[PDB]
Amino acid sequence: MEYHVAKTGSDEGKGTLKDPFLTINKAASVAMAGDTIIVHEGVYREWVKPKYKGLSDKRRITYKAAEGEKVVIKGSERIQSWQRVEGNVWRCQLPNSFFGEFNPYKEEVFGDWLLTVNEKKHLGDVYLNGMSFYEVTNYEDLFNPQLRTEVLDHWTQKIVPIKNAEQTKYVWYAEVDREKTTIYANFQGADPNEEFVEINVRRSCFYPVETGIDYITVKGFEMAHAATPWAPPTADQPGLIGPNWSKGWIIEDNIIHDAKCSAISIGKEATTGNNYRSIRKDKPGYQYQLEAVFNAKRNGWSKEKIGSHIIRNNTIYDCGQNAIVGHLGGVFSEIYNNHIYNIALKREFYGHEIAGIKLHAAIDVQIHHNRIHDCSLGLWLDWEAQGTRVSKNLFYNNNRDVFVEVSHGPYLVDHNILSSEYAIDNMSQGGAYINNLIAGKMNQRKVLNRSTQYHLPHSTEVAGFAFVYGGDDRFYNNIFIGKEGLENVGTSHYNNCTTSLEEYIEKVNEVPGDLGEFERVEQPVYINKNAYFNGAEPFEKEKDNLVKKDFDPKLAIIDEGDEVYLSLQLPDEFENIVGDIHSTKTLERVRIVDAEYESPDGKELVLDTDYLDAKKPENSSIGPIALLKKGNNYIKVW
Amino acid sequence: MEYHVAKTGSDEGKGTLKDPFLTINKAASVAMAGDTIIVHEGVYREWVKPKYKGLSDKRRITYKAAEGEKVVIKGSERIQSWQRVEGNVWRCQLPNSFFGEFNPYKEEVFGDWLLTVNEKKHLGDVYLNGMSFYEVTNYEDLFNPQLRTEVLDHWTQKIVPIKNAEQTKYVWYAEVDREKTTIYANFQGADPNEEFVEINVRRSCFYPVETGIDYITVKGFEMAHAATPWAPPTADQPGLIGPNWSKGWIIEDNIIHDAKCSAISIGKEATTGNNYRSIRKDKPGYQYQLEAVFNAKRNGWSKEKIGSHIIRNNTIYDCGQNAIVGHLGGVFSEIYNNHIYNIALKREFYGHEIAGIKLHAAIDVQIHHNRIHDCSLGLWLDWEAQGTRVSKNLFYNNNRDVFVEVSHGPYLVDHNILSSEYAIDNMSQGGAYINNLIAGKMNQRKVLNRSTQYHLPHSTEVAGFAFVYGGDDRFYNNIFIGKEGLENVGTSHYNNCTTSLEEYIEKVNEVPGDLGEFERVEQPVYINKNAYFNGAEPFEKEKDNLVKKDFDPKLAIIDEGDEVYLSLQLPDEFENIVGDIHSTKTLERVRIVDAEYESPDGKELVLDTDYLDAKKPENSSIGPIALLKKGNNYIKVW
Amino acid sequence: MEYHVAKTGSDEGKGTLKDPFLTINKAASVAMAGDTIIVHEGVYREWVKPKYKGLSDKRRITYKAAEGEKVVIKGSERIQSWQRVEGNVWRCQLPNSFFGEFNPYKEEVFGDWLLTVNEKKHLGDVYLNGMSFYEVTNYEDLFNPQLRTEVLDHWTQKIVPIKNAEQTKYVWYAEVDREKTTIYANFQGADPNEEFVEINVRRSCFYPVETGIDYITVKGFEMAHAATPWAPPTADQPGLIGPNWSKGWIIEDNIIHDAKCSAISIGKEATTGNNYRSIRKDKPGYQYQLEAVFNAKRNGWSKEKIGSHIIRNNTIYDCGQNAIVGHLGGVFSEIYNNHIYNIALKREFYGHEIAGIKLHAAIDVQIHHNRIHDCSLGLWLDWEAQGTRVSKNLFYNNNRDVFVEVSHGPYLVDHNILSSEYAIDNMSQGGAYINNLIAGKMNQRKVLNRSTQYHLPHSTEVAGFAFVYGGDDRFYNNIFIGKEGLENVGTSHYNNCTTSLEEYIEKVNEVPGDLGEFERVEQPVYINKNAYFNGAEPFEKEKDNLVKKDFDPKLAIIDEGDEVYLSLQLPDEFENIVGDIHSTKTLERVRIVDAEYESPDGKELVLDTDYLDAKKPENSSIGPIALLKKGNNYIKVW
Ligand SMILES: O[C@@H]1[C@@H](O)[C@H](O[C@@H]2CO[C@@H](O)[C@H](O)[C@H]2O)OC[C@H]1O
Ligand SMILES: O[C@@H]1[C@@H](O)[C@H](O[C@@H]2CO[C@@H](O)[C@H](O)[C@H]2O)OC[C@H]1O
Ligand SMILES: O[C@@H]1[C@@H](O)[C@H](O[C@@H]2CO[C@@H](O)[C@H](O)[C@H]2O)OC[C@H]1O
């Protein structure tokens, strides 16, 4: 059946093209495996809840915007009952029933690993012609808000400019009592009943209320204004839109924005763990998280029931925690051709779950051809990044590009452009960095007080757990570019490491013993054919590399809106260093996990196409793009 | 922490004895492992939703009535806005908002195995001073309702007396449109605003809205009027009160009544299957049910996470489907000392899920010392009755007492009084009927077109599945009593069976082959030391028995309210037949499941105590009570 | 490390090219992950037992014949100590110690589903210059054996010519006592000490004695003379060569022959079940088999640990039970480009486990491009043929080509040439027969007294179990060819079936009920675009077909040794039927299992290449080869 929803329809109608329903949730309550829901032009202020599941990729349930029509789903409501209090501060009042069981003005940003704990923030929000406001703590703070032009990035501890300084003068504050909710905001001179003013109301826009609602496709909608809660790996992880613990979703061609915390969630649900550290306080989140993994396994977490989602061609921005989030629920998924930006820039709250994309247990996840910029952290892989592949992505203007934490691999980062000043946070082992352009520092550190799971290949089955001893990384064909006043760009971080698994084994086995003997020897690194310009430093034992510390490539990423260009100068010597095609055959297996770098299907992986998808010969330029050559280079990269 | 709830309290209070909360759900939203909630006298019209789980039997969360106080939880509301329409018919009207998302007047009795499909019934109800009404189909049926005094028992096809004929004149009917719910009822002359008139409103009284809320004890409440839905093994199975897919609850000392369908549910939740036959219509519930078993297994169904509930010392009556119901969620549970009666007597709807107690997959469930009467069916064990023990129960005045269907055992039925005319529906194999008084017929039938699971011992692990070939039953020390014209009382049903596993094996292996050779031989039966009176007939190959077809025991169960007596005459020959103490050692293992009759803990089981819990010697009177002797017997049995 | 084994070697040697080992088992006791064992020219009389496992597809352990060298592994020994008894009968005697724990002359062909129980046969064998003998039951039968030229095919009950009639005069008989093994045989005039005479000695040739020895490649050997035991699905299933319950073997380019029972085994091991029906006799093999599936599941039977083997480019012939056999151990494997013939033609023993290839639980197994002829039965898929694809194979001169038993699909049989007179035994549902040439009858039957497992897609997880109700099959683009006096060729078998899942559901849901209602409606069949010649008959409701009862295609398969040709005449109308390219989108899902016809990786399957591997046009003619045309066709098919 092909159901139709239109602003001229009726939920008492048949749901056909000639007699369409009025609300999307109406169609969602009757559609079944194989059906399509076509939604016509209009703004739908409702939380859509798919009731029945698709039964296979062929028999999915498809929700999409009519061809050529602008369809918006919002979790907000326009408010036109504001009353001026004094100066530029206005107030509106709503009976609590307006929000029902979930009141964003009563709900707090709360949970494990949330660090901003003295100044409570809530899930509500006020918007003036689309621009969200800043929450303030007291009634008094509403009247003469101070314009701010700079802010502290918590992780890097650097003061950075505020993108939209003007927005800092727009503030809101709310009070919830037993009968009603009173919301105040400073509109700086505008008449809020006259301008287009909205407030957050619902938690989500498109998210099932039951787990297991598989095979749903959601396509071509603009979705916005969702009061989503802090979403750590140890709690339920709702988002503005998400599959809610199921399999085979396809979320594509949507423009998603203004989720209080995470926009798209492919995370876990409450049953396997729900902020026990923050609520019970008897054990840390670390201990509760490794436990949630086993609880999930007992609840059927496996390729047969969970994950294999596709997130593609979406534009996601202006969210406070992530554009994409998820612990466990995203295994085997694919995330590609997305444009992600402006994530967590307002910095109203901070904690260890913020990034454009953050995934825990991203087993065999493929993250490729995405454009991620203007985020405090572009991508964060945290625990169990096994089989994960980060390939052909464009990262720029981020406070940090990539962070892979407490993982054992094998994980692969290939043909990416990582152009931010702080490019890599590496607190893992078992990685392969192949043919990337890396223009920022790398912070590499062992993790000896936290042990995390590893798995059988291409599976959620647990094989064991390990600490991160550091090393056991591969670096081939990368172009590293330092900068005056920037330390740690390159691979010199591994100077004390062995250079082959055979060497590591010979050394460990020089004297009888067990664990202690292994801990006294540094793991091996496999590093060759990298270039180091403008101050980047090489691993001391690399055999074939190109080092020109005094050469400045003058790298620039030129963002012109729908298109982005890469500008880079390369020295004549660039022509004399040639890279090999890497593959399952050329990359040494990771030690602890004892597994190869292969395709998700178990077959050999061959890294022979570059960032621009051009096939390359056995000897070609190093770096992410085969076309780069000595001299001037100006290449369209998006 | 010991929380207090009282009608003088406040939900903004501390919840202490001096500053109590007002609603039980307020305490349920903050209590944590190890806390107790003490509720003071009053009627609490709310659905209590335990929020946090107990963490062990020691650290449970206890909800209880204050010592000596009458505490009532109801799902109904008193209505005093009725307006006379005409005659004795009155009407009230409520906004749909009054019911929230669950409206009993809109929600139908619906689902797999519901047979009364031409006459739509709903989950609502109307009560006059506690007496529920009969729903009618048309507005017109309200004005001159017919008093009925007899009704057809569906399974037995016998017309029987309606217990409360007067009640048949009180009828209701309702309509729900987009805005309002309108209820009409005939009050036969009473003034509904003057009398105490209530209507169903909420689905449950005490039921978590999340699964996994373990170790909760609910004690000393009267709970009533819940609009519970039709609960087959293939759907979500909510009830008036239940653990909702969790472990270790204790439901004791409560008085529960007027659940539309099932009162106490220890069943399954929606995720493992939800009326797929009725909704998708592509495969029968039979096929969907065996699938739900494997779906649950992948969803954690095991002794470590589900079951081990205790339901004791409760009185449960006036429910339309069951006093206790549940598929999968009741494994390893114990049900004892409960008084169950008046279950499904109104017969407003009928289907194959009705009985005082009905349990699917009652693995190792212990059902003992219960008083069950005035039910269309007392107990129904349907599928996987493995390790189940029905012992020392008192069944009387039921259209049928016990039904064990498509199970392979080993299941044990010992020391019971099955006094109804139709005592047993036996559509299984692997049973042991030891020391019972059986005074009604047995209908024994093979089931060759349905195969069902069997398990490893004391576990939910699946070992295989099988059809019911019939036989492979044990009958020792039972007293059978027929009645004029009543056929099939006794054990002659098995006349063609083999008499030992050795004989079955020898006959099967006479000619080479496989399945076909096994199917041509009847399974063995182990029958000895039974007495047959007043028409009961024995297995023709039984070696030691007492048959006195002409002797009438003049059996009578005298129910005097809180006490019940058994009146029974026995012949002088009764003294010459003596029974052995049966045990794991004396009961032959079941053939297909290949398991012994033992205790839930895997230890030897010895059946040396009778119905009155008196220890008995090796040679003792047969039947359920050792005190029974030749002559007159008048014994208190409750 | 590359180890070398040569007849000039020594097992005290280093095992290098210059200082090679002498036996292959010596290399097998020291080789580790990533090593290669190169065996040089010669005959190695030993059972090779791989000791250490390969660790991945990249780090396997490879055993292969040196390039261009003839390497033979045999389980036999040459005997030259024969003494003439009388006439042409000779005798040899050996110490029992010569056979060790396994004596072929003592061991019997024994076990579940073995039907020849009067005539005890043993696992030994005698060969004269490579030609095996027939065992006789009594000493006296040795002296004047009668030449036999015809024999009864047990299944078809037709008397057929004996291929090698002369071989019927060579017989052997043996006795084993406390000390010695004495073997007698009639050499019909030859001198066994002068000729090359061998006897079976060892059970296997290349088989680990431990399970889990994964990732082994065996290439380029000739292997022969193994005293392998009867291998039903309910027992241990050893073979001449096999992985013995592990994952990722590659058995290729070998010539394998004279395995007493099965040659290559990808079956199960003893712990999950071992002839309990035959040994305990309390339950049938059917019951013990369904149990073995669950026992294996608890023993880790899953894609992560078992299966994914590849058997390609081998020639396997002269085996008494199968060329390839296996229950459970072969999941997800691929079998292709093998030449299989002369399987079970001596008929010294018979039972329900015989076929060129027999697999139980062939989940997602791909069987393609195989040439299978001169077998009593070409291929037998028995239980759990889910996701199995039988494609582009050449079947001729077999008493029966294919048998798919008690499976529920989705299973695919496409682009095959099934040229024998008895082409298909179909005792399943859920099949799709696409673009085949089928020249023999089909026997299709329901199986209502045996229920068997089905699974989640692409997994060993159990989803349910079911009887075979019949139907729910698809037949598109097949060319059926009848023959005078041959009945049941075509698709008329399905005449009472519904024609769409919609029709089935509508009819079942005409009257309320459950299983009984579903049982009275015949499952749907999807049949169109088939041709029926020379007496083949169509499904009465097929909409687009070509029926020419009087047209005789005079099909003939001309076997010229290494090349095989197809000769076929087609009518002028042949090109009027235009076939569609089938795929996941065009094949209706199977009903009970509720799954689509997909690729093993879970993606869309498109059948767009023909038997000759030519890309097929959208508007193609039917049958297995797109180039078939009206008139004469003479095509090389091997
Ligand atoms: O379990 C995840 C953690 O691995 C991660 O937190 C890291 C360790 O704790 C902090 O002190 C570190 O700075 C941070 O990188 O995120 C929290 C949780 O998702
Ligand atoms: O699956 C359960 C059934 O075993 C049971 O239904 C039985 C079989 O169908 C009816 O024809 C029989 O009369 C009934 O006893 O209940 C339905 C379901 O819970
Ligand atoms: O379990 C497998 C059987 O399905 C199969 O036996 C079939 C059923 O019994 C016989 O009467 C049939 O002819 C045969 O096809 O093989 C035995 C076992 O492998």
CA of C379 to the centre of ligand 3 (A): 14
Pair (B79, B67) in one structural domain: no
Best residue for ligand 3 mutational test, from C112, C278, C291, C352 (most atoms within 8 Å of Cβ): C352
Concatenated DSSP letters for B303-317? TTTSB--EEES-EEE
Best residue for ligand 3 mutational test, from C405, C406, C448 (most atoms within 8 Å of Cβ): C405
Query: What is the domain count for chain B?
Result: 2
| Pair C403, C423: CB distance under 8 Å | no
Q: Does B255 touch chain C (CB under 8 A)?
A: no
Q: Which member of B12, B52, B210 has the closest CB to residue A271? A: B210
Chains that touch A (3 or more CB pairs under 8 A): B, C
Residue B228 in tokens: 């519970």
Q: Does A461 touch chain C (CB under 8 A)?
A: yes
Q: Which ligand has an atom closest to residue B230 CA?
A: 2
Cα angle: C96, vertex C97, C98; to 5 degrees = 85
- Contact call for B449 and C505, based on CB within 8 A: no
- Contact call for B463 and C291, based on CB within 8 A: yes
Nearest ligand 1 atom, CA A285: 1
Count, residues in chain B: 638
Q: Does A209 touch chain B (CB under 8 A)?
A: no
Identify all chain A residues contacting B52, using CB atoms and an 8 Å cutoff.
279
Residues 6+ apart with CB under 8 A from A100: none
Nearest to B527 by CA among B487, B574, B471: B471
Count, residues in chain C: 638
Residue A633 in tokens: 């280079």
Q: Is the dihedral of CA A263, A265, A269, A270 positive or negative?
A: negative
Q: Which of C155, C184, C202 delimits the end of a domain?
A: C202
Strand pairing of A357-360 and A379-382?
A: parallel
CA of C516 to the centre of ligand 2 (A): 11
Q: Does A57 touch chain C (CB under 8 A)?
A: yes
Residue A568 in tokens: 């880079």
Q: Is A493 helix (H, G, I), strand (E, B) or coil?
A: helix
Give the residue carrying structure tokens 């009917």.
Answer: B173
Containing A370, the helix (H) or strand (E) segment is: none
Cα angle: C588, vertex C590, C593; to 5 degrees = 150
Nearest ligand 1 atom, CA A450: 4
| B522: CATH | 2.160.20.10
Q: How far is A300 from C176, CA to CA, in rounded Å?
A: 55
Distances (CA, A) of B56 to B267, B405, C190, C257: 21, 34, 83, 63
Q: Where are the beta strands (DSSP E) in B397-505?
A: 402-405, 411-414, 417-418, 422-427, 431-434, 437-438, 441-444, 447-455, 462-468, 474-476, 479-481
Pair (A30, A112) in one structural domain: no
- Contact call for B449 and C448, based on CB within 8 A: yes
Q: How far is A309 from A287, CA to CA, in rounded Å?
A: 28
| Pair A614, A598: CB distance under 8 Å | no
Q: Which ligand has an atom closest to residue C427 CA?
A: 3
Q: Is the dihedral of CA C147, C150, C153, C159 positive or negative?
A: negative
Pair (C56, C128) in one structural domain: no
Residues 6+ apart with CB under 8 A from C107: C122, C123, C227, C229
The protein residue whose alpha carbon is closest to atom 6 in ligand 3 is: C352
Q: How far is A344 from A319, CA to CA, in rounded Å?
A: 6
Task: Give me the sheet containing B76-78, strands edge to edge.
Answer: B76-78, B197-200, B126-128, B131-132
Residues 6+ apart with CB under 8 A from C3: C15, C16, C20, C21, C27, C30, C31, C35, C36, C37, C38
Distances (CA, A) of A503 to A394, A498, B123, B624: 36, 6, 74, 79
Q: How far is C351 from C261, CA to CA, in rounded Å?
A: 11
The residue of chain C with its CA nearest to that of B462 is C294
Q: How far is B532 from B548, CA to CA, in rounded Å?
A: 6
Q: Which ligand has an atom closest to residue A290 CA?
A: 1
* Helix-, strand-, coil-residue percentages of chain C, each rounded to 5: 10, 35, 55
Q: How far is C360 from C328, CA to CA, in rounded Å?
A: 6
- Contact call for B514 and C286, based on CB within 8 A: yes
Q: How far is A349 from A230, CA to CA, in rounded Å?
A: 10
Whether the CB of C497 sits within 6 Å of ligand 3: no
CA B29 to chain A, closest CA, distance in angstroms equals 13
| Pair C109, C124: CB distance under 8 Å | no
CA of A392 to the centre of ligand 1 (A): 26
Q: Does A18 touch chain C (CB under 8 A)?
A: no
Q: Which member of C585, C594, C602 has the closest CB to residue A55? A: C594
Partner residues linked to A115 by β-bridges:
none
Pair (B79, B224) in one structural domain: no
Q: What residue numbers bound the domain in which C444 lies?
A: 1-74+203-638
Identify all chain B residues contacting A12, using CB atoms and an 8 Å cutoff.
178
Q: Does C281 touch chain B (CB under 8 A)?
A: yes
Whether the CB of C113 sits within 6 Å of ligand 3: yes
Pair (A163, A275) in one structural domain: no
Distances (CA, A) of C327 to B276, C83, C291, C323: 33, 44, 13, 14
Mutate to test the interface with B, among C115, C288, C291 (most CBs of B within 10 A): C291
- Contact call for A271 and B211, based on CB within 8 A: yes
Header resolution in angstroms: 2.0
Whether the CB of C425 sits within 6 Å of ligand 3: no
Q: Print burial letters for A439-450: b (CB count within 10 Å at least 16), e (below 16).
A: bbbbebeebeeb
* Position B525, amino acid: V
Q: Is the dihedral of CA A277, A283, A287, A292 positive or negative?
A: negative
| Pair C356, C324: CB distance under 8 Å | yes
Pair (B168, B290) in one structural domain: no
Return the DSSP state at C160: E
Nearest to A537 by CA among A571, A499, A491, A573: A491
Pair (C598, C629) in one structural domain: yes
Q: How far is C333 from C57, CA to CA, in rounded Å?
A: 14
Q: How far is C336 from C393, CA to CA, in rounded Å?
A: 9
- Count CB atoms within 10 A of the CB of residue A508: 16
Ligand 1 binding pocket (C-beta < 6 A) is A 113, 232-233, 286, 289, 352-353, 382, 405-406
Pair (C383, C434) in one structural domain: yes
The protein residue whose alpha carbon is closest to atom 9 in ligand 1 is: A352
Q: Is C194 helix (H, G, I), strand (E, B) or coil?
A: coil
Concatenated DSSP letters for C494-542? GTT-BSSHHHHHHHHTTS--SHHHHHTSPPB-EEES-EEETT-B--TT-
Pair (B426, B321) in one structural domain: yes
| Pair A431, A473: CB distance under 8 Å | yes
- Contact call for C281 and B509, based on CB within 8 A: yes
Q: Does C602 touch chain A (CB under 8 A)?
A: yes
Return the DSSP state at B230: P
Pair (A79, A47) in one structural domain: no
> What part of A 385-444 touches C (C-beta under 8 Å)?
none
Q: Does A459 touch chain C (CB under 8 A)?
A: yes
Q: Does B112 touch chain C (CB under 8 A)?
A: yes
| A96: CATH | 2.60.40.1180
- Contact call for B294 and C467, based on CB within 8 A: no
Pair (C197, C209) in one structural domain: no
Supply the Cα-derived Rg of chain B in whole angstroms: 25
Residues 6+ apart with CB under 8 A from A510: none
Q: Print burial letters for C237-247: b (CB count within 10 Å at least 16), e (below 16).
A: bbbbbbbbbbb
Nearest to B313 by CA among B390, B398, B217, B404: B217
| Pair A112, A277: CB distance under 8 Å | yes
Q: Which ligand has an atom closest to residue B406 CA?
A: 2
Q: How far is A555 from B143, CA to CA, in rounded Å?
A: 89
Whether the CB of B233 sits within 6 Å of ligand 2: yes
Per the entry, the structure determination technique was X-ray
Q: How far is C40 from C57, CA to CA, in rounded Å?
A: 25
Best residue for ligand 2 mutational test, from B275, B352, B359, B450 (most atoms within 8 Å of Cβ): B352
Q: Is C351 helix (H, G, I), strand (E, B) or coil?
A: strand
Q: How far is A612 from A368, CA to CA, in rounded Å?
A: 12
Q: Which of A136, A171, A202 delimits the end of a domain?
A: A202
Q: Does B449 touch chain C (CB under 8 A)?
A: yes
Distances (CA, A) of A175 to A59, A85, A588, A619, B96: 47, 15, 60, 66, 29
Pair (C195, C259) in one structural domain: no
Nearest to A129 by CA among A169, A187, A184, A83: A187
Q: Is A141 helix (H, G, I), strand (E, B) or coil?
A: helix
Q: Does C59 touch chain A (CB under 8 A)?
A: yes
Q: Does B460 touch chain A (CB under 8 A)?
A: no
Nearest ligand 3 atom, CA C382: 4
Task: Give me the sheet containing B134-135, strands edge to edge.
Answer: B83-86, B89-95, B180-186, B171-176, B134-135
CA of B285 to the centre of ligand 2 (A): 9
Whether the CB of C328 sits within 6 Å of ligand 3: no
Q: Which of C202, C233, C259 delimits the end of a domain?
A: C202
Q: Which ligand has an atom closest to residue A321 CA?
A: 1
Residue A141 backbone phi and psi in degrees, to 5:
-70, -10
